[PDB]
Design a protein around this nucleic acid. Structure first.
Ligand SMILES: [Mg+2]
Ligand SMILES: [Mg+2]
Ligand SMILES: [Mg+2]
Ligand SMILES: [Mg+2]
Ligand SMILES: [Mg+2]
Length: 94
RNA sequence: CCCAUGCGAGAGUAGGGAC
RNA sequence: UGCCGAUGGUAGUGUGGGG
């Protein structure tokens, strides 16, 4: 099972997102179901290595944010236009 | 082009549909 | 441009600064 550690974002928007990426992290979003969407931030390198395995995109993953696990599937990924980096990820609740 | 701050598409995604 | 349509990200951008 893939276990991803994340934190809830304290700020959003272009400025905040660029700050994260300049600091070796990147934004992501968890949506789906009855609960409201949850905007989170991830460690770039750790997730990048994880998603290098094809199962990352087929399996139900576990994101540890706050203190509980959420159970999601990768729904979409935005990659840098010309750099080997992850820009954003959509996670859908499972 | 970048930073701070405010504003924020187009496309696509979740979801919905008496079609 | 052919049904409606979030959230987040992206483009662009007002103000101030940097270059
Ligand atoms: Mg700005
Ligand atoms: Mg739109
Ligand atoms: Mg749209
Ligand atoms: Mg449907
Ligand atoms: Mg938006």
């Amino acid at each position: 099972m893939f276990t991803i550690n994340a934190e809830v974002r304290k700020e959003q928007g272009k400025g905040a997102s660029r700050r994260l990426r300049a600091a070796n992290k990147f934004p992501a979003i968890i949506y789906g179901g009855k609960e409201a969407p949850l905007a989170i931030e991830l460690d770039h390198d750790k997730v990048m290595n994880m998603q290098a395995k094809a199962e990352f995109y087929s399996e139900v993953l576990t994101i540890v944010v706050d203190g509980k696990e959420i159970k999601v599937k990768a729904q979409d990924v935005q990659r840098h236009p010309y750099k080997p980096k992850l820009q954003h990820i959509d996670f859908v609740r499972a």
